[PDB]
Amino acid sequence: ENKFLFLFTITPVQSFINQARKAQDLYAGSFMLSHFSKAAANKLKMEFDCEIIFPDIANNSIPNRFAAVVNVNENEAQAVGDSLQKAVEAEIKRIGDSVINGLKINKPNGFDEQLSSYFTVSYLFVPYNEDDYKQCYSELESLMGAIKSVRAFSQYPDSERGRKCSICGERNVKFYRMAENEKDIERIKKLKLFSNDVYAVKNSDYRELGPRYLQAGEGLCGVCFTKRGLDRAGIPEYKAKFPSTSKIALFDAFKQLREKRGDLGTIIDSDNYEPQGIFALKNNKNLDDFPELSEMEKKNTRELYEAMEDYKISYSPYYAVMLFDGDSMGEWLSGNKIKDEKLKEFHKELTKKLGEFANAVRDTIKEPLGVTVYAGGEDFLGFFNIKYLLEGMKHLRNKFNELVNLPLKDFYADNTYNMTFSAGAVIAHIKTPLSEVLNWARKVEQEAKDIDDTKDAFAIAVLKHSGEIEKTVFKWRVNDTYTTDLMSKIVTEINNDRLSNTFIKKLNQELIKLLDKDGNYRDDNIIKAEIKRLLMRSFMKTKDEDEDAFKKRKAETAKELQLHNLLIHSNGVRNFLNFLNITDFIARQAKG
């Protein structure tokens, strides 16, 4: 035979990206994975004859895997895979070598053994008989899902003896910075690091390495370091300056300030002010904690703080992490829900539409809304300022439905079908380490998909200080109205001093005493009456309104919130209480 299919993949996807402490590290990891995938794809496309199926290589952030329709003699086929594996390995090695040399620092020992064993490649051809696309694709995907079970790895060398990294816990620290504990010592290698060769610098000595590339006693592996010094990697696409988690929470305040002051903008975009500092000065503290340039850098930070305090621009310390993935993708791509003989065209159509949606998502999400860490195909992951979360969620869902689903309605086997996605957002304090936030976000996203066989639901959660969360699961639509719409309406009413939030605490206190162990109070009349009474009591009268119109607004407003419908469709009562509590919390963290 002469025609073959293809499927390329890189194994570590979730764990590798998760291992991060600063948003820059996460962005760098996603960028590295995308770059390797694009390198392999470009090598294949521009050398042999083939056409790509799943990811449009022209995109900006391709996923970890891709396919194609390659035609070659079977005898030579095995060679191509070896070529791709060698090319990817060489690219990884080159990026590491460039990263070390970029800072003109003598390379430590052990790098080549901690950067060339942390990735994997795999591929699985399959004969193609151009008569049943369904069978060939099903066979290929089954074989590809089975082949990955045989995980082969090479043992670490006997040289492994270290103190970890504070990011991983599975490798020898090959970098360090001398904290304030000791003024200066070579004993640090003797006792603290317990190792022979890990190049270090003194806390006072900052000439070879700038502040961005280490801090205090921060250990880093080979990979951890390669994943942070990529600014000098020499790849044009990389964006040199990426906002940090702390900066994202300041998106709104800066935007509000710019509308009132013009000259202040020059410093704002200069990236010459510590972002986390202004939070310290808010809590009545000194700047001695974080040594800085002091070339008027602290002066500029103090000026910004004084200006924002003067203009009365309140900002909060919480941010949000949101991610969403398409549901039931396997069935959709598998042709089980597509016309009998139109799968091959559907693949290309869906790939084009998903590329268009990815470009639209990239274009829409920008400051002060947030930043998109990576958005490609169905997947997505980004940060949102807490004052725009619901608008962003609704906009993304509506755009997906308008740009990917409705245009493809013709191909659907039954017109009643739909292609939707579930989402999950976790709020957290900026001080919290990012890895736990990411893992909790993944957990809530995977849970929200289990509401029912139809999926089409979203979850919101708050990561408390102790380390537990309270979540709420809801459908996207409740009788032709987005639930986030009702959440936004309640938040807007509470913030504008038109409805006090005493109808949430009172309801929590009243309805807790009747809830069973799991929580199901199945008497409708009592709960409906309680909701109506408490809501109608909670309203307030504005100074402009009279004593006659108030009785009209008080009745029209209660007909918009639709609390009864939320309760009917809430699949439980504690879920409804948690929904209200999260709405109140969000309304609090905003200006009101």
Binding-site sequence positions for Zn(2+): 165, 168, 221, 224
Residue number, 58 or 150, with CB nearest to other proteins:
150
Identify which of 225, 230, 194, 215 has the alpha carbon closest to the alpha carbon of residue 32: 230
Q: How far is the CB of 154 from other proteins (least distance, A)?
A: 5
* Cis amide prior to 63 (ω within 30 degrees): no
Q: What's the CA gap between 537 and 502, in Å, rounded?
A: 9
Ramachandran region of residue 469, left (φ > 0), alpha (ψ -120 to 50) or beta?
beta
Identify which of 196, 199, 202, 236 has the alpha carbon closest to the alpha carbon of residue 220: 199
Q: How far is the CB of 212 from Zn ion (least distance, A)?
A: 18
Q: What's the CA gap between 314 and 591, in Å, rounded?
A: 6
Q: In what order do the strands lie in the sheet with 370-374?
A: 370-374, 381-385, 318-326, 421-429, 457-463, 469-475
Name which of other proteins, Zn ion, none residue 119 binds, using a CB cut-off of 5 to 8 Å depending on partner kind: none
β-pair partners for 7:
67
b/e per residue 266-277 (b: at least 16 CB within 10 A): ebbeeeebbbeb
Non-local CB neighbours of 380 within 8 Å, separated by 6+ positions: 322, 323, 324, 325, 361, 372, 374, 396
Name which of Zn ion, other proteins, none residue 539 binds, using a CB cut-off of 5 to 8 Å depending on partner kind: none
Residue number, 212 or 261, with CB nearest to Zn ion:
212
The answer to whether 85 contacts other proteins (rule: CB under 8 A) is yes
Residues that bind Zn ion (CB under 5 A): 165, 167-168, 221, 224
Q: What's the CA gap between 293 and 296, in Å, rounded?
A: 8
Identify which of 350, 167, 203, 317 has the alpha carbon closest to the alpha carbon of residue 249: 317
What is the per-residue binding string for other proteins in 238-277, x denoting contact by CB under 8 A?
----------------------------------------
Q: How far is the CB of 20 from other proteins (least distance, A)?
A: 18
Q: What's the CA gap between 494 and 226, in Å, rounded?
A: 48
Non-local CB neighbours of 70 within 8 Å, separated by 6+ positions: 3, 4, 5, 6, 44, 48, 49, 50, 80, 125
Name which of Zn ion, other proteins, none residue 167 binds, using a CB cut-off of 5 to 8 Å depending on partner kind: Zn ion
DSSP E strands in 168-317: the ranges are 175-178, 199-202
Q: What's the CA gap between 329 and 379, in Å, rounded?
A: 11
Name which of other proteins, Zn ion, none residue 221 binds, using a CB cut-off of 5 to 8 Å depending on partner kind: Zn ion
DSSP at 482: B
Which listed range, 230-238, 398-406, 447-455, 519-527, lies at the site for other proteins (CB under 8 A)? 519-527
The answer to whether 234 contacts other proteins (rule: CB under 8 A) is no
Q: How far is the CB of 537 from Zn ion (least distance, A)?
A: 56
The answer to whether 171 contacts other proteins (rule: CB under 8 A) is yes
Q: Please report, as residue ranges, which positions from 20 to 79 form the binding site for other proteins (by CB under 8 A).
A: 74, 77-78
Name which of Zn ion, other proteins, none residue 165 binds, using a CB cut-off of 5 to 8 Å depending on partner kind: Zn ion
By three-state DSSP, how is residue 232 classified? helix
The answer to whether 513 contacts other proteins (rule: CB under 8 A) is yes
Q: Two tokens at 121? A: 């490649």
Q: How far is the CB of 5 from Zn ion (least distance, A)?
A: 37
Identified binder of other proteins from the candidate list 73, 149, 286, 415, rule CB under 8 A = 149
What is the per-residue binding string for other proteins in 190-229, x denoting contact by CB under 8 A?
----x-----------------------------------
Name which of other proteins, Zn ion, none residue 224 binds, using a CB cut-off of 5 to 8 Å depending on partner kind: Zn ion
Q: How far is the CB of 331 from other proteins (least distance, A)?
A: 9
What is the per-residue binding string for other proteins in 150-169, x denoting contact by CB under 8 A?
xxxxxxx-xxxxx------x
The answer to whether 431 contacts other proteins (rule: CB under 8 A) is no
HSE-CB at 86 with a 13 A cutoff on CA atoms is 6
Residue number, 172 or 301, with CB nearest to other proteins:
172
Name which of Zn ion, other proteins, none residue 284 binds, using a CB cut-off of 5 to 8 Å depending on partner kind: none
Are the C-beta atoms of 474 and 425 separated by less than 8 Å? Answer: no
Q: Please report, as residue ranges, which positions from 448 to 477 form the binding site for other proteins (by CB under 8 A).
A: 462, 464-466, 468, 470
Q: How far is the CB of 182 from Zn ion (least distance, A)?
A: 23
Interior angle at CA 314, CA 310 and CA 320, nearest 5: 150
Cβ burial, residue 553 (10 Å; 0-12/13-18/19+): middle
Non-local CB neighbours of 313 within 8 Å, separated by 6+ positions: 253, 256, 257
Q: How far is the CB of 301 from other proteins (least distance, A)?
A: 27
Q: Two tokens at 456? A: 């089409």
Q: What's the CA gap between 398 and 396, in Å, rounded?
A: 6
Residue number, 145 or 291, with CB nearest to other proteins:
145
Residue number, 126 or 178, with CB nearest to other proteins:
126
Q: How far is the CB of 105 from other proteins (least distance, A)?
A: 25
Are the C-beta atoms of 220 and 214 separated by less than 8 Å? Answer: yes
Residue number, 177 or 471, with CB nearest to other proteins:
471
Identify which of 372, 357, 441 has the alpha carbon closest to the alpha carbon of residue 404: 357
Identified binder of other proteins from the candidate list 81, 108, 275, 592, rule CB under 8 A = 81
Length of the chain, in residues: 592
Q: Please report, as residue ranges, which positions from 528 to 567 form the binding site for other proteins (by CB under 8 A).
A: 529-530, 532-533
Q: Strands 175-178 and 318-326, how do they pair?
A: unpaired
Name which of Zn ion, other proteins, none residue 249 binds, using a CB cut-off of 5 to 8 Å depending on partner kind: none
Identified binder of other proteins from the candidate list 514, 540, 549, 555, rule CB under 8 A = 514
Name which of Zn ion, other proteins, none residue 465 binds, using a CB cut-off of 5 to 8 Å depending on partner kind: other proteins
Q: How far is the CB of 202 from Zn ion (least distance, A)?
A: 23
Residue number, 234 or 330, with CB nearest to other proteins:
330
Residues that bind other proteins in the complex, under the rule CB under 8 A:
4, 74, 77-78, 81, 85, 121-127, 138, 140, 142-143, 145-147, 149-156, 158-162, 169-172, 194, 330, 462, 464-466, 468, 470, 505, 508-509, 512-517, 523, 525-526, 529-530, 532-533, 581-582, 584-585
